[PDB]
Amino acid sequence: VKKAHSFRRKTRGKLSKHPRRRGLPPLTRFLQEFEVGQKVHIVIEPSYHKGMPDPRFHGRTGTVVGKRGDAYIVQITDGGKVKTFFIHPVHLRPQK
Amino acid sequence: AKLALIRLRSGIRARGEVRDTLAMLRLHRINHLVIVDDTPSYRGMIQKVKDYITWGEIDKETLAKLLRKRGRLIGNKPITDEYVKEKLGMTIEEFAEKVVNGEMKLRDLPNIKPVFRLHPPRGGLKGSKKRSFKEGGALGYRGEKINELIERML
RNA sequence: GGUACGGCGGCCAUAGCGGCGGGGCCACACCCGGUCUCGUUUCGACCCCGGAAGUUAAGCCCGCCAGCGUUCCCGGGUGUACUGCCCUCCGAGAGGGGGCGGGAAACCGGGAACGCCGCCGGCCA
RNA sequence: GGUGCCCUAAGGUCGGCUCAGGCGGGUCUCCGCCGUAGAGUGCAAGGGCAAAAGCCGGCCUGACUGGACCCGUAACAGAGGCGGGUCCAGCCGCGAAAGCGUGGCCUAGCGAACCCCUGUGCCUCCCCGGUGGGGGCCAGGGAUGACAGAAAAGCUACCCUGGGGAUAACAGAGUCGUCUCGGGCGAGAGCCCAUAUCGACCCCGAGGCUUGCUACCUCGCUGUCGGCUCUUCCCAUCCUGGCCCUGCAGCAGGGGCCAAGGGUGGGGGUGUUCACCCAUUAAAGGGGAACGUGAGCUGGGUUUAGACCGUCGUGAGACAGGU
RNA sequence: CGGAGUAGGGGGGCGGUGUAAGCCGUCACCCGAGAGGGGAACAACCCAGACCGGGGUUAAGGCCCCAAAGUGCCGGCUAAGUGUUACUCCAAAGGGUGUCCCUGGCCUUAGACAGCGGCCCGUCGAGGUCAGGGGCCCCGAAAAUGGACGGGGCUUAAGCCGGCCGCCGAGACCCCGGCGCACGGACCGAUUGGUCCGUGAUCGGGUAGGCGGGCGUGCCGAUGGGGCGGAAGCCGGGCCGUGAGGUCCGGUGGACCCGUCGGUAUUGCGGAUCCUGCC
RNA sequence: GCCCGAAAGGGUUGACCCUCCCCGAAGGAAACACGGGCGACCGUGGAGUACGAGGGGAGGUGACCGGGGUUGCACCGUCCGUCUUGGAUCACGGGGCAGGGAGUUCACCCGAGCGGCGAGGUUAAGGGGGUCAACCCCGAAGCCGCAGGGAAACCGACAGGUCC
């Protein structure tokens, strides 16, 4: 029996949280700042359901290209296609 | 230190990444030899193709004989004492003494080819193409004992 | 310069639970009362309002402790289990072995560990 | 394992407060305490959540309008319809403020073209201008569950065509659960005595003579069962030759070893193979050969076309049911 | 921007299901679409990727005869023709004073059997006895036409274990010559180009399919030629050409034919249970 | 090995064969002399010698050579077309020869290899002339293009401002 893809499919470990985080993250993440050309990691915080992209791209690295609202625009490479996301900065993490 | 690498086995029945690594290392055919610098980046590639080559450390004398006999230029023209004494202010033994220790690279001689194409070995490979050289075959790391093999293939 | 004071914070258990000894001009508390600002499906017990008669007993502050929990290091367990590539290696077969590379978890013994770092004050001189 | 729904609150915000379970009191909802959530969340599973995303309340209706861009279904790598997300502007709610609010904490609860209905305010109907009525743009709705969407019941044994070993019945190959023939161990039974004989429960196998499973060869090669005729082979031996143990006195029986030279027949009902029965006999063994053998016979059975009965069916008709 | 083909896949390794055979997927190494050398023969197991003529050294593996090269060397085991099987194609649980070895206890100048008599002396006086672990072989072990280590045959092997030394053996690798291709350059052209030079360890297998250049057949417009001193056609032969094919010699025959340039087409056959005619 | 062999192929300006020398790629011995190993054998010297594909030259002998027909020996080799994962197949087509025998034509659309004119390009039906189905001149009706947006009413743009 086949099964389409959907947001929360096979997310039992990827979107599970360690039993010792369990609540809000520290507030040094909602207020992260980023510049253009800055490379970022896509790492999802399961407690915040706003600005969360498809978990398909959990663990990938992209580049910032702009800003819309309180969200940042991110480009990733998927094979040879470019894909653009609007992500809240609690789901992101700077390189180095 | 400088490393010598000889290819022994074919790529039919081999994975697709080993063939590409070998192409990068310029080992396209069998009984073909390449000299290389000892570095982690090169050790990684040798580790990947450990099962189709032999390798070791080369010596001044053996590289001199190699250059004289099996060294070629562009056009498959041989290498000569006059050519070297002209393009560089030394002869072939000195050239090799340098290469194997630093102070110079092979490509410092113009129109030199980075591939030495050898003759099959006299008395043959005295072991199995299927085992390593430490357990009784032909492949893998052999140290100062790659020079005997080069001289047999020369 | 001094403080057995304080407010806002960062890392978020090496900070936690439990246990003990000591301290109180200035400051935080516990306290007396509440008509009014406020309200308790019923009580100034909770919260809000004005003072201090009293004391440090509690919270706060200084110091320590390895009983439980967490984290890091040293030796063992052990180069054990599992594993990537190659093999005209073993074996009736199931499954195992060799070479080149990576490499645990439990458990045992021994250490450290009962929080670290910022900005601003207030008062004594 | 679940959805083809429910909700004016179970939807938005503001404030206050903490759960299940147990211990200790009081009798058959009351006070205190321990309690990382072991409860609850509108509905499955998973995930998330404690000064809360749970419970108690107060005020509201962002379950709105006009429009952009991007992710998924559908990775890499094409898309109609649907779904989600980040925003600009407008009008508003809650709140002291910051801030939040484009339905339900996240992931299910649904649907093209054409046609019709409703809403809104504008464009148009053959020389011109009016009235009635028609056509168009925009938005919402009525359905296709075979859910990227035909308006729709059956017999063929009188059957036809085009094709298929891409696909069965039949023999072959493969395999061996089943099948036939065996073994290890020693519980226990045998007056007592584990092995004369029997050998449980459990464990290990051979063969390819039953039956199944699969679908590798063959869809016009031949499609078949039994019988008669004729030749040959295996041994896991029924008699005939030779031996060993016995719970072998003799006559016999039981169990085992070698041995495949010869033999293994006649009849009754049934299409039968096998099975059953009679009278004899030294004994009246079991299997293979394309289930040996239709360019060797026969033709009883089985699978055409005719007809009868019983059941089933409105009927045409069917029956691996009989004649 | 244009032209396709492909919508039955299979060996081998990994996973789910299944008594298993098989079924469903995944990986991208091979067959399909891949010659040659070996496995007795084998689609996919080993070596190895192929223009043409020649020379030499190796790989896989092999060296008693078949059959090219060892009746090879050292040490040890097997007596069962076991075996002589990398994989394709090959039997167990349970057992064995069969033999060769490791280990650890107890005994010993009188031990472990015997014999002479009542635990014992002497007696023949030197190695015994108990357990556990391994290697090879044996029992367990029965089929149908007449037989299969590939066969003959092999027993201090021509078998197995552990090691060693020399030879044979591909189209692989080295060398010599020749052809073509791709890239670049020069010169040269009445038109898609031609002659030469350099480079190629990193060019030289091919089904479906796509692209480039050439051979051949009939008619037209032009140009240049041949023929009764023998055209076309037919037979047998020589030379050139990778080749499609061209041209000459001899014979037969008795009137028409070819070349170059450009155009045109009922333009090339081994097959259709093809059609006609003949045998 | 036997047989044909005139010409068109070579050859008496000398065929086949014979011997002699020089150069010589990759490669490459042996006898023999000394020593190492229980031994099969190896090391040093002999020796990069003798030889070696081919490239040149100097001579003797004096008529075949290449080619063709058939056949002996040794090695190698399971036909052809076809679908199929898979063909020597116990899968289909296949007695022999000769002649015939299968991507054509129109109309629209998308593209290219060349050629003409060029903000314009192009003629159709037809008409006139001629040496009369070839040739020459006229004929722009219409179609495409130069301005697009919008269902419609209707409205109506940069012959160059900056950068890489």
PDB file of C-alpha atoms (C1' of nucleotides) in Angstrom, chain B residues 8-10 12-14 16 19 26 28-32 70 72 75-77 113 115 117-121 123-125 129-130, chain E residues 11 28-31 44-50 56-61 166-167 172-175 198-204:
ATOM      1  CA  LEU B   8      47.745  -4.365 -11.916  1.00  0.00           C
ATOM      2  CA  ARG B   9      44.029  -5.171 -12.286  1.00  0.00           C
ATOM      3  CA  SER B  10      41.258  -4.176 -14.657  1.00  0.00           C
ATOM      4  CA  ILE B  12      35.676  -4.438 -15.428  1.00  0.00           C
ATOM      5  CA  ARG B  13      33.788  -5.783 -12.394  1.00  0.00           C
ATOM      6  CA  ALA B  14      34.972  -2.786 -10.352  1.00  0.00           C
ATOM      7  CA  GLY B  16      32.313   3.265 -10.635  1.00  0.00           C
ATOM      8  CA  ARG B  19      37.560   3.893 -12.035  1.00  0.00           C
ATOM      9  CA  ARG B  26      46.296   8.875 -14.447  1.00  0.00           C
ATOM     10  CA  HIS B  28      44.201   4.214 -17.256  1.00  0.00           C
ATOM     11  CA  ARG B  29      45.802   0.954 -18.376  1.00  0.00           C
ATOM     12  CA  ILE B  30      47.696  -1.943 -16.870  1.00  0.00           C
ATOM     13  CA  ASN B  31      51.440  -1.936 -16.215  1.00  0.00           C
ATOM     14  CA  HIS B  32      51.395   1.823 -15.937  1.00  0.00           C
ATOM     15  CA  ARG B  70      61.063   4.400 -20.024  1.00  0.00           C
ATOM     16  CA  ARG B  72      59.248   9.922 -22.747  1.00  0.00           C
ATOM     17  CA  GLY B  75      55.736  12.891 -29.129  1.00  0.00           C
ATOM     18  CA  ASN B  76      57.077   9.766 -27.396  1.00  0.00           C
ATOM     19  CA  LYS B  77      60.626  11.001 -27.916  1.00  0.00           C
ATOM     20  CA  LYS B 113      54.955  13.053 -19.420  1.00  0.00           C
ATOM     21  CA  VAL B 115      53.159   8.420 -16.923  1.00  0.00           C
ATOM     22  CA  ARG B 117      54.415   2.725 -19.360  1.00  0.00           C
ATOM     23  CA  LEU B 118      56.269  -0.405 -18.304  1.00  0.00           C
ATOM     24  CA  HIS B 119      56.897  -3.872 -19.723  1.00  0.00           C
ATOM     25  CA  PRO B 120      55.358  -6.888 -17.985  1.00  0.00           C
ATOM     26  CA  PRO B 121      57.578  -8.508 -15.361  1.00  0.00           C
ATOM     27  CA  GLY B 123      59.675 -14.196 -14.141  1.00  0.00           C
ATOM     28  CA  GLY B 124      56.170 -12.845 -13.806  1.00  0.00           C
ATOM     29  CA  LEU B 125      54.433 -11.676 -10.715  1.00  0.00           C
ATOM     30  CA  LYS B 129      46.631 -10.953  -8.134  1.00  0.00           C
ATOM     31  CA  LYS B 130      43.915 -11.708  -5.559  1.00  0.00           C
TER      32      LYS B 130
ATOM     33  C1'   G E  11      22.740 -12.877 -13.419  1.00  0.00           C
ATOM     34  C1'   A E  28      24.213   0.016 -10.481  1.00  0.00           C
ATOM     35  C1'   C E  29      29.201  -4.219 -11.395  1.00  0.00           C
ATOM     36  C1'   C E  30      27.904  -7.458 -15.591  1.00  0.00           C
ATOM     37  C1'   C E  31      24.271 -10.134 -19.945  1.00  0.00           C
ATOM     38  C1'   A E  44      25.778 -12.940 -17.192  1.00  0.00           C
ATOM     39  C1'   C E  45      31.831 -17.362 -12.141  1.00  0.00           C
ATOM     40  C1'   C E  46      37.745 -15.969 -12.984  1.00  0.00           C
ATOM     41  C1'   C E  47      41.433 -13.075 -16.532  1.00  0.00           C
ATOM     42  C1'   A E  48      40.269  -9.323 -19.777  1.00  0.00           C
ATOM     43  C1'   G E  49      37.283  -4.694 -23.077  1.00  0.00           C
ATOM     44  C1'   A E  50      38.402  -5.646 -30.116  1.00  0.00           C
ATOM     45  C1'   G E  56      58.326 -10.575 -27.849  1.00  0.00           C
ATOM     46  C1'   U E  57      56.872 -10.880 -22.466  1.00  0.00           C
ATOM     47  C1'   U E  58      52.893 -11.861 -19.096  1.00  0.00           C
ATOM     48  C1'   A E  59      47.338 -12.836 -16.535  1.00  0.00           C
ATOM     49  C1'   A E  60      43.718 -16.329 -15.148  1.00  0.00           C
ATOM     50  C1'   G E  61      45.328 -20.843 -14.368  1.00  0.00           C
ATOM     51  C1'   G E 166      61.763 -23.298 -12.289  1.00  0.00           C
ATOM     52  C1'   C E 167      58.893 -23.483 -17.116  1.00  0.00           C
ATOM     53  C1'   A E 172      46.113  -8.084 -22.158  1.00  0.00           C
ATOM     54  C1'   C E 173      51.309  -4.982 -21.825  1.00  0.00           C
ATOM     55  C1'   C E 174      56.069  -3.546 -24.703  1.00  0.00           C
ATOM     56  C1'   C E 175      58.140  -2.663 -29.898  1.00  0.00           C
ATOM     57  C1'   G E 198      51.594  18.897 -35.153  1.00  0.00           C
ATOM     58  C1'   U E 199      48.950  16.213 -30.934  1.00  0.00           C
ATOM     59  C1'   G E 200      46.487  11.842 -29.142  1.00  0.00           C
ATOM     60  C1'   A E 201      48.836   6.964 -21.582  1.00  0.00           C
ATOM     61  C1'   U E 202      43.794  10.438 -21.235  1.00  0.00           C
ATOM     62  C1'   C E 203      40.957   8.080 -30.085  1.00  0.00           C
ATOM     63  C1'   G E 204      39.702   2.875 -32.722  1.00  0.00           C
TER      64        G E 204
END
